[PDB]
Amino acid sequence: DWEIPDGQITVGQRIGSGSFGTVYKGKWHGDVAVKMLNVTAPTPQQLQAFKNEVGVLRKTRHVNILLFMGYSTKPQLAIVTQWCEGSSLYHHLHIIETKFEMIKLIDIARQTAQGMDYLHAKSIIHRDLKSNNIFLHEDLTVKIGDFGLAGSILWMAPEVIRMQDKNPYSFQSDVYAFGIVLYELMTGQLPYSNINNRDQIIFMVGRGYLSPDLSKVRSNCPKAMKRLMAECLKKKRDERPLFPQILASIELLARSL
Numbered sequence: 001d002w003e004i005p006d007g008q009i010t011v012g013q014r015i016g017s018g019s020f021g022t023v024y025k026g027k028w029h030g031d032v033a034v035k036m037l038n039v040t041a042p043t044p045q046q047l048q049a050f051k052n053e054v055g056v057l058r059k060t061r062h063v064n065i066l067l068f069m070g071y072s073t074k075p076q077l078a079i080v081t082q083w084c085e086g087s088s089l090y091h092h093l094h095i096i097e098t099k100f101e102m103i104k105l106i107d108i109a110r111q112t113a114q115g116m117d118y119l120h121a122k123s124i125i126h127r128d129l130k131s132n133n134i135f136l137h138e139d140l141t142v143k144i145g146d147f148g149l150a151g152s153i154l155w156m157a158p159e160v161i162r163m164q165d166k167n168p169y170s171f172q173s174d175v176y177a178f179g180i181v182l183y184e185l186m187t188g189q190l191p192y193s194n195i196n197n198r199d200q201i202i203f204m205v206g207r208g209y210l211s212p213d214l215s216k217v218r219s220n221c222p223k224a225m226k227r228l229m230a231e232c233l234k235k236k237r238d239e240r241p242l243f244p245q246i247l248a249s250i251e252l253l254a255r256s257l
């Protein structure tokens with residue numbers, strides 16, 4: 001079992017604060033991170049989502065997936081994971097503008113792909129893969145998490161952005177978010193930088209009038225990688241490759257550098 005007996009977790013510095021969640025740096029057999037719920041009495045829907053998150057996390061045991069460590073019900077609903085040292089891929093690329101060498105960029109892609117393939121094998125759809133959810137641990141290991149606390153439309157596949165079905169979320173949807181993550185790694189930028197209207201980005205991506213400008217890729221970006229990016233970003237979801245095949249392509253281009 002993974003229930004941490006109450007009076008063990010020492011919640012400390014509030015690192016992130018959101019609408020429902022609040023992440024704290026903590027202490028439980030060393031430094032840990034604690035996702036918590038603000039309320040003293042939780043909603044039956046809140047208790048379900050906590051049960052679901054812990055449910056997903058207890059199915060994961062992989063280096064590219066954030067280490068689930070335990071849960072706690074009393075006093076507040078809390079999910080304990082490892083504490084990570086460093087910053088998210090988003091922070092690196094877009095906040096502090098870290099200039100990674102092409103070889104590292106491809107490795108960050110390979111690691112994200114590795115973690116993605118694991119989740120998909122375990123029939124887990126992330127639904128929200130983005131650079132803010134890729135943690136570059138000890139500055140070298142990708143750790144896929146859910147560092148969000150609330151949409152994030154830049155990584156959404158046209159079929160998702162359209163909401164033309166009850167569940168438009170697929171393994172393919174995640175492949176498109178991965179495609180956008182590759183665009184970030186290879187351009188050092190977010191897509192649709194020149195468009196200042198969210199609703200229009202939404203409208204156009206859905207209608208397929210707008211796609212990421214692949215000409216923005218770094219000069220040293222391998223032709224194979226740019227091709228892979230293009231496949232991951234296909235408007236038609238059936239045309240998108242899956243992570244076993246994505247991994248294969250990344251690992252191959254990595255060898256030719």
Ligand SMILES: Cn1c(Nc2ccc(C(F)(F)F)cc2)nc2cc(Oc3ccnc(-c4ncc(C(F)(F)F)[nH]4)c3)ccc21
Binds near residue numbers: 088
């Ligand atoms: C419960 N829960 C999850 N859920 C999750 C669900 C599914 C999956 C998957 F299965 F789909 F993979 C993966 C994760 N993700 C989390 C992320 C959390 O934040 C953390 C964790 C570790 N370190 C930090 C940090 N270190 C330095 C800094 C900074 F930013 F302050 F510098 N922040 C921050 C806390 C709790 C988290």
